[PDB]
Design a protein around this ligand. Structure first.
Ligand SMILES: Cc1cc2nc3c(=O)[nH]c(=O)nc-3n(C[C@H](O)[C@H](O)[C@H](O)COP(=O)(O)OP(=O)(O)OC[C@H]3O[C@@H](n4cnc5c(N)ncnc54)[C@H](O)[C@@H]3O)c2cc1C
Ligand SMILES: Cc1nc2c(=O)[nH]c(=O)nc-2n(C[C@H](O)[C@H](O)[C@H](O)CO)c1C
Ligand code: SF4
Length: 508
């Protein structure tokens, strides 16, 4: 009789959100809050603040155009209590409501808090059915499995969604086309220019507000080019499918100095706040293969990242929280080096990754994994400090997707739940996959001395340190044998080198 209060959070900017689907436009009200609690829980990159608040403001206008009564509480409002819970209470004092309806969110701590709120009306929490696997479906799949392997989850999602299925068989006769012959770019191949979205008038307004009011947050705002509404996001997606997808598979793991985008889709910051739909993106990519515009290996590689990795890490997060966020399997206790924030390091690969984070709030997957993620793991940085960095510096970072990729896949702080084996690597890997080392001050062919690439001694120290644990893992057989044949003097030398580096870098 009085209507429902419907909450929409900053990463829920979708017409099809479960909290909106059955609204009574004549009686109901939508609440959206620009919340300083959420904006300072981590000190997010300036560009992430611009993206979320610009997109929120535009989504509110789209709802109003459709006939919704929207209560929009801006960051400038002098009565704004600052928190989601406080603003819910205040909305419930302003007029009569029958219930609150909301969609379960993407942060365990906020979800736990909202479920415990004492409110004068009932609250109904609906699952976020924008994702392709529900929380209960992942738990059912995971029951009774001694280890959770993404590849077997991926096969189930292929069958459930029907993507790249010809009848009951996978297209092409294999599930996966992952190649092992990944290489760096040929010396003459210049990566293509990428479409960036110039700030529209709403985004320009938010840009000025963030510059003036959050000047202490990490990162540059100049040159902001992320999409902030479904039209802008669709343009980015069209550009990727038409222009980039045919080469997606060839260069998925390559790195190139000062070319942070390469052939990646650049859609995660829009997808993670709801401006694009995961099933629609995948259908678009499948159609490009079916109609002869992209090869199957590229399209399968792309889809696997969305219905395989993205749904899998979300499943692990809700299955294992809150204990997951407390695990520190390798007892890492070091500090994060200051160059993660300033970029002021002679390691050319690290400096470039930090530069991309500062200027664009983006780096692609192998850079996050094998450069700054691997380095943090080898240094022994406390996982809390690594999660903080990955949450701050990237525009696509939300806890449900950051934490299993960071505490799990990149640093092995979860002891192998997400990724099975540590992704440890020496400089030889970065040299094989990038053009960084020819321009670097350090010599990637050396392990000891002031000119040695720091990854090389750090890698062997890490293997040495954890040799008993990594033994019986199964997938570390080759490094452990190599270490085993090393005379004690060789091992003592790289131990003392690794110790020196941790001091030089401010870790210990
Ligand atoms: C340490 C570390 C931290 C990460 N933190 C985040 C994060 O906070 N947010 C985030 O969205 N991704 C995160 N990733 C995953 C991946 O790096 C990003 O999704 C990707 O770089 C986004 O670029 P893109 O849109 O150009 O992706 P593409 O290379 O074009 O891939 C297509 C899509 O696949 C999905 N995807 C690919 N890899 C993953 C993955 N491992 N997990 C989840 N989705 C994936 C994304 O939706 C992405 O848009 C992290 C990976 C690592 C190693
Ligand atoms: C920066 C930021 N700001 C807001 C905000 O002002 N209002 C809001 O409702 N949500 C915001 N968010 C997203 C949440 O803090 C959180 O990460 C997601 O809702 C996870 O579900 C973020 C990340
Ligand atoms: S030599 Fe070492 S530090 Fe320098 S770019 Fe190569 S991997 Fe990075």
């Amino acid at each position: 009789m009085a209507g429902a209060l419907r909450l929409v959070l900053g990463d829920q900017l979708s017409d099809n959100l479960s909290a909106l689907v059955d609204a009574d436009l004549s009686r109901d009200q939508v609440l959206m809050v620009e919340s300083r609690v959420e904006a300072t829980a981590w000190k997010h990159h300036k560009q992430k603040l611009v993206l979320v608040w610009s997109a929120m403001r535009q989504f509110a206008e789209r709802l109003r155009a459709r006939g919704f009564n929207v209560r929009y509480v801006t960051l400038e409002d002098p009565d704004n209590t600052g928190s989601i819970g406080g603003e819910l209470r205040r909305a419930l004092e302003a007029r009569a409501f029958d219930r609150v309806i909301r969609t379960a969110c993407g942060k365990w701590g906020l979800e736990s808090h909202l479920l415990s709120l004492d409110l004068p009306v009932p609250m109904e929490t609906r699952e976020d059915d924008r994702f392709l696997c529900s929380r209960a479906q992942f738990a059912a799949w995971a029951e009774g499995r001694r280890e959770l392997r993404m590849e077997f989850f991926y096969r189930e999602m292929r069958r459930k969604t029907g993507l790249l299925m010809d009848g009951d068989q996978p297209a092409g006769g294999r599930w996966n086309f992952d190649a092992e012959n990944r290489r760096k770019l040929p010396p003459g191949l210049r990566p293509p220019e990428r479409l960036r979205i110039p700030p529209n008038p709403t985004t320009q307004t938010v840009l000025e507000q963030v510059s003036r009011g959050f000047d202490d947050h990490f990162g540059e705002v100049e040159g902001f080019g992320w999409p902030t509404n479904p039209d802008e996001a669709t343009a980015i997606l069209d550009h990727f499918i038409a222009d980039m997808l045919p080469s997606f598979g060839d260069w998925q793991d390559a790195m190139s100095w000062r070319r942070p985008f390469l052939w990646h889709s650049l859609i995660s910051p829009a997808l993670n706040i709801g401006l694009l739909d995961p099933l629609d993106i995948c259908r678009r990519a499948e159609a490009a293969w079916r109609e002869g515009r992209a090869p199957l290996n590229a399209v399968e590689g792309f889809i696997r990242q969305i219905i395989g990795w993205r749904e899998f890490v979300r499943g692990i997060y809700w299955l294992k929280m809150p204990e997951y966020a407390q695990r520190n399997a390798l007892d890492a206790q070091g500090k994060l080096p200051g160059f993660y924030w300033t970029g002021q390091t002679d390691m050319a690969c690290v400096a470039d990754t930090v530069r991309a984070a500062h200027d664009h709030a983006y780096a692609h997957h192998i850079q996050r994994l094998m450069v700054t993620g691997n380095l943090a793991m080898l240094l022994g940085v406390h996982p809390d400090a690594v999660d903080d960095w990955y949450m701050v510096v990237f525009a696509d970072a939300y806890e449900w997707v950051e934490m299993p990729n960071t505490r799990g896949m990149a640093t092995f702080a979860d002891g192998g739940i997400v990724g099975s084996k540590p992704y440890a690597a020496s400089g030889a890997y970065i040299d094989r996959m990038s053009d960084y080392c020819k321009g670097c001050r350090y010599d990637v062919k050396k392990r000891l001395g002031d000119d040695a690439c720091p990854f090389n001694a750090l890698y062997w120290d890490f293997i040495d340190r954890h040799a008993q644990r990594l033994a019986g893992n199964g997938r570390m057989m080759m490094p452990l044998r190599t270490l085993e044949k090393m005379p004690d003097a060789e091992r003592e030398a790289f131990r003392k080198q690794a110790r020196a580096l941790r001091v030089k870098m401010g870790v210990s």
